């Protein structure tokens, strides 16, 4: 009997204000602590905040600074604004009814979830580094390059202009709380190679037009 | 928020039984009652579990929940492909103004190969990056299954607080699973303590490397 309903818009403008709205029915505006929790993809639940209809608000101190609800109980709504969005906020953003006291007998009540995804057409170009290779016996080497803080997706990386396939192992990218990326490529190698083959790791960043030849070297 | 603590992965075969733990604090578990959900992509959480035992109408009774002082467990018997989600503990915390805290979260498999732990390598800043005033250290994990881990940080032996980025584990070319993780430090951080170490935890293995400035 008791249904929410989140509402707002699915597709944002970076920097702006992300802001939702929950529909209560079924249920008194005073019946619960009306709360927003966001799975952003890969990453665990959050809570982020939550709002009593008096006005009473607790908000995650993570997010505290850009972050503010509200509720209208004329409407029997309550929202959210998030301020100065990345693509760190794209996320599955949730509204619930929870029972602070569980004086409720059925516990909390649950909306449905969106999927926001924050946009930006802006870009910026990796930072490559060395990872390089210790000083590795007996058998094989691991070095590599890391490729930090860039935008959008995608990046590729090469290893000697494409001659060196095998052994290359390059690992999904990791979004940041900044709402920028950065990924490693690793390739292994033979430990007799080092003194004499030459490793080049080449980082292509079309979005930014970028492109950076890094090469590997002991130490 | 604050860690309400769970496994990275629990796993079994078809019909068998599988348990969740949830460690929590005197804050949190110790005031407060338990809530479980189930997580799928995509959709808000299910409600699974309310007030440490209790089902919500719609829920299967293979779902049990139990509680101790600061500890609660989630069992999930005769497990099904349809229970393979992730699953998270949470619970109010009467720190600041009051938190709701939700676990790390636990992914449920049904086991389709066998088990593999995986493999650390850990990479220490590079001088380069020092050079520009930065310090990352970059911990690899490679060739686990199920595809679930978790990744924790010390600053010689203690825990560190900030800085940390994890990524999601991803299917490899042969259905293993890889992950990154990332701490992020100020070259004073790195060159002040002693050693940093990357410890990694799956299923019935830890595995943790560990890098100094010297």
């Known amino acids: 009997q008791v249904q929410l309903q989140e509402s707002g818009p699915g597709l944002v403008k970076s920097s702006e204000t992300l802001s939702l709205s929950c529909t209560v029915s079924?249920?008194?505006?005073?019946?619960?602590?009306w709360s927003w929790v966001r799975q952003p993809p890969g990453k665990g639940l959050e809570w982020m905040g939550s709002?009593?209809?008096?006005?009473?608000?607790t908000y995650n101190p993570s997010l505290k600074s850009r972050l503010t609800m509200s509720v209208d109980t004329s409407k029997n709504q309550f929202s959210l604004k998030l301020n100065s969005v990345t693509a760190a906020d794209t996320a599955v953003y949730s509204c619930?009814?929870?029972?602070?006291?569980?004086?409720?007998?059925?516990?909390?009540?649950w909306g449905q979830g969106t999927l926001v995804t924050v946009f930006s057409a802006s870009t910026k170009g990796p930072s490559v580094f060395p990872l390089a290779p210790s000083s590795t016996s007996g058998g094989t080497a691991a070095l590599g390059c890391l490729v930090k803080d860039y935008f959008p997706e995608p990046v590729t990386v090469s290893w000697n202009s494409g001659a060196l396939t095998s052994g290359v192992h390059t690992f999904p990218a990791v979004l940041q709380s900044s709402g920028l990326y950065s990924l490693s490529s690793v390739v292994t190698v033979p430990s007799s190679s080092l003194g004499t083959q030459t490793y080049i790791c080449n980082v292509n960043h079309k979005p930014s037009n970028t492109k950076v030849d890094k090469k590997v070297e002991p130490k | 928020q604050s860690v309400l603590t769970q496994p990275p992965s629990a796993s079994g075969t078809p019909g068998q039984r599988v348990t969740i733990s949830c460690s929590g604090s005197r804050s949190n578990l110790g005031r407060n009652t338990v809530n479980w959900y189930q997580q799928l992509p995509g959709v808000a959480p299910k409600l699974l579990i309310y007030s440490n035992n209790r089902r919500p109408s719609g829920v299967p009774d293979r779902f049990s929940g139990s509680k101790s002082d600061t500890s609660a467990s989630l069992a999930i018997s005769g497990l099904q492909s349809e229970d393979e989600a992730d699953y998270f503990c949470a619970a109010w915390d009467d720190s600041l103004n009051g938190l709701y805290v939700f676990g790390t979260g636990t992914k449920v498999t049904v086991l389709g190969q066998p088990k593999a732990a995986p493999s650390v390598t850990l990479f220490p800043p590079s001088s380069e990056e020092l050079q520009a005033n930065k310090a990352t250290l970059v911990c690899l994990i490679s060739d686990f299954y199920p595809g679930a881990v978790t990744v924790a940080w010390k600053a010689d032996s203690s825990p560190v607080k900030a800085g940390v980025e994890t990524t999601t584990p991803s299917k490899q070319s042969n259905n293993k699973y890889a992950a990154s993780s990332y701490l992020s430090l100020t070259p004073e951080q790195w060159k002040s303590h002693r050693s940093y170490s990357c410890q990694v935890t799956h299923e019935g293995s830890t595995v943790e490397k560990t890098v100094a400035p010297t």
């Open positions: 709002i009593y209809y008096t006005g009473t608000i």
């Open positions: 079924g249920a008194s505006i005073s019946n619960f602590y």
């Open positions: 619930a009814g929870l029972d602070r006291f569980n004086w409720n007998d059925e516990g909390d009540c």
